[PDB]
Design a protein around this ligand. Structure first.
Ligand code: NA
Length: 390
């Protein structure tokens, strides 16, 4: 993969696809972490004598939705880079082109949300050709956008010499340690409500790991297939055979699997609702398992002892509804407490859990909040990565 130093930025206007998809409220960025993380790439290019045009998505609006304008992000960026300016013009527009052509060495221009362009998500080749007028070289520094063939990710990269920025490279390398020669014992903790959403990553990682811990509602599909009585717990009836086959593959590959022993159940998903603890294989109707129980949390933590690599993605229960978030928080706490293990966390709820444990710095790598990381682990590559090779 072509990396940042392969580009000679001197006297060139460089187009950079960054990830500034940050939380915004009342016209103010609520967390500028993503903006800060993009700085090394920008500083390198500016020190190299280039001018910069920045492109980013914000939310997933289908067109020019003012709620998702990058204006607030431009303000936050300028506070760190005084030479940066924001222009409220879609990147495929003639106004954007003129603004970009007027830039001088050292200047930085952030254009409007790429999602405002109708051809962006369609990877419109003509739109990509217009993006190609914005710079002489292209730097992709947004791993979280690399899983989709979009005009500002793949399309323009095919018209300009393309390179991976510092951040993009860092993310790819971290996840690559979960695919190539990972340190063993290697344990994987997967959660989520449906096994169907984990089939790809499970089949991809099974031949590479030693232990697989399964939590979340998807565990009930496995448990029912194995003969357990899960009461009114969520189950994908059309995936019962598949669940059993995945366990069969684990047995064939020498991967030890762990499933819940007990669960915290309730008659309905309600915050603070009264609960009952039942064996995961004996949940009486009308109860439904909503989180892994205390014995399961303990067992899952013990299963990680000795691991040198741990990858975790997914909630252990109904994370957004207390007290059914305890299992997820407990797994995060257990992983943070490990010694001698490279730990990687991905997934919406699990990353959210890590962010409120007050132990985030304890993890080896917390992947980009999105689906790109999981797709990369399943396929071994991404569209945005392929345009940086060759
Ligand atoms: Na794979």
């Amino acid at each position: 993969m072509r990396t940042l130093l392969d580009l000679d930025p001197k006297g060139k206007r460089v187009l950079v696809r960054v990830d500034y998809n940050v939380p915004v409220q009342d016209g103010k960025v609520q967390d500028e972490t993503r903006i800060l993380e993009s700085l090394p790439t920008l500083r390198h290019l500016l020190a190299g004598g280039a001018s910069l045009v920045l492109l980013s998505h914000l939310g997933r609006p289908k067109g020019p939705d003012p709620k998702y304008s990058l204006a607030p992000v431009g303000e936050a960026l300028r506070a760190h880079l005084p030479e940066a300016r924001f222009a409220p013009f879609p990147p495929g527009s003639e106004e954007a082109r003129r603004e970009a052509e007027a830039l001088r060495p050292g200047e930085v221009l952030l254009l409007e949300n790429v999602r405002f362009e109708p051809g962006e998500e369609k990877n419109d080749p003509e739109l990509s050709a217009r993006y190609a007028r914005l710079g002489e070289a292209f730097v992709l520094d947004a791993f979280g956008s690399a899983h989709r063939a979009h005009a500002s990710v793949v399309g323009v990269a095919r018209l300009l010499p393309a390179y991976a920025g510092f951040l993009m490279e860092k993310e790819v390398r971290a996840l690559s340690r979960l695919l190539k020669d990972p340190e063993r014992p290697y344990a994987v903790v997967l959660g989520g409500a449906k096994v169907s959403d984990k089939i790809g990553v499970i089949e991809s990682l099974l031949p590479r790991i030693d232990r697989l811990l399964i939590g979340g509602a998807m565990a009930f599909t496995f448990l029912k297939a194995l003969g357990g009585e899960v009461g009114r717990s969520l189950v994908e009836e059309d995936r019962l055979d598949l669940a059993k086959d995945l366990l069969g593959r684990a047995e064939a590959l020498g991967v030890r699997v762990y499933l819940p022993e007990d669960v915290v159940a309730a008659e309905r998903i309600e915050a603070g609702v009264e609960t009952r603890v039942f064996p995961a294989r004996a949940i009486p109707v009308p109860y439904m398992g909503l989180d892994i129980g205390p014995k399961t949390r303990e067992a899952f933590a013990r299963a990680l002892e000795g691991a040198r690599t741990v990858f975790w993605n997914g909630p252990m229960g109904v994370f957004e509804v207390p007290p059914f978030d305890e299992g997820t928080l407990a797994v995060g706490q257990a992983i943070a407490a490990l010694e001698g293990a490279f730990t990687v966390v991905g997934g919406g709820d699990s990353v959210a859990a890590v962010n409120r444990l007050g132990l985030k710095e304890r993890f080896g790598h917390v992947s980009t909040g999105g689906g790109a990381s999981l797709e990369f682990l399943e396929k071994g590559t991404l569209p945005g990565l392929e345009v940086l090779e060759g």
